[PDB]
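Retro notes, structure queue

What went well: the backlog is down to a handful. What didn't: a couple of records were mislabeled last round, so from now on we paste the full input next to the output in the thread. Example, using Mannose-6-phosphate isomerase from Salmonella typhimurium:
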Amino acid sequence: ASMQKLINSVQNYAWGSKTALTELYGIANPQQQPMAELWMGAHPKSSSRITTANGETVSLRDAIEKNKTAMLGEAVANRFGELPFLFKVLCAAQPLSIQVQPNKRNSEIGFAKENAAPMDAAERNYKDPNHKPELVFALTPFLAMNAFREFSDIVSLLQPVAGAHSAIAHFLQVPNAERLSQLFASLLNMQGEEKSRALAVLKAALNSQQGEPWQTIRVISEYYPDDSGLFSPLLLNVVKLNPGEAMFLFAETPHAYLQGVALEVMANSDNVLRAGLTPKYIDIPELVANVKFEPKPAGELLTAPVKSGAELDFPIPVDDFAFSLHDLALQETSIGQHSAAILFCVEGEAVLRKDEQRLVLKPGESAFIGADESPVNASGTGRLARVYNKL
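Corresponding output:
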């Protein structure tokens, strides 16, 4: 088959929505399980599968291993040696942890620092030496946090909780990167009476303070009542993405997914440094060494796409992946790339054609197109999301 309909894995993590994938796409869930992530790719823990001329399904990862140049293209093959991204539908029924991704050089350093002394333990920050760029694209209204607010923005939000902790008063007297870093670390490091004081003062402020981000803190607090993370909407931008909007998650920058359904594209790494809204241990010094305490203004948070014909590209400052949306109509458009691609039906209904082969995708279904099989022609109605490499 020139085009391969994907059989995909759904991770049933405890935080997933019991309904989102069913409401959006008709995906069955009779056991009423939490369906947290739908994986499109070649991850070894749970690769997508494809069907052979034969009738057998095979791992997409194994099929790529067997024919890398043909499937990935020479460029991706020689640079990555594998499908360099994982593509997901994320369906957060509750807020998730704050995270930070180290950049490439520090991932390499950290990965070698740690090898020299316990793989799947919980002081293991670097499970690998790859970086982890990500893009999120909203499928329903998507509440997230991303990056530090402008300092005057933080100063204004902290005033009502100045008495919460002395690190707050400290930042207020001189609101700079250094004191923001001390504040961030002190908040995460709070214990016992120090922490309960800080949390008591924050909970009370929620009665005197209306609107955002206070409202966001209320939402988080239903799931994380004793977490120092509750201060983070006062330091970090809270953003509500409308469906069709995207944000690229830069390295060294805190972020969190709080509510709603999105597509996510990432490079392949299981590194994560957590920075709150988690019960796990956090290595605060390592976290701090990997955060850029530089404000990001709200106007620069969303990725500005570029529209050319039926294609809306989302420019990504990283090589690991690219991402585009394709408006479908009756007349075919050619969708071609020098890499492997995964095409995913966001809404409507797509007919892919490659010569005589016709493959129909309904919303939520996806197909893999090997490098040797580009281009394919698309028609129908709605939109197709495409993940690929521009290299």
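Agreed that this is the format going forward. Reviewer comment attached to the example: The CA atoms of residues 13 and 111 lie 26 Å apart.
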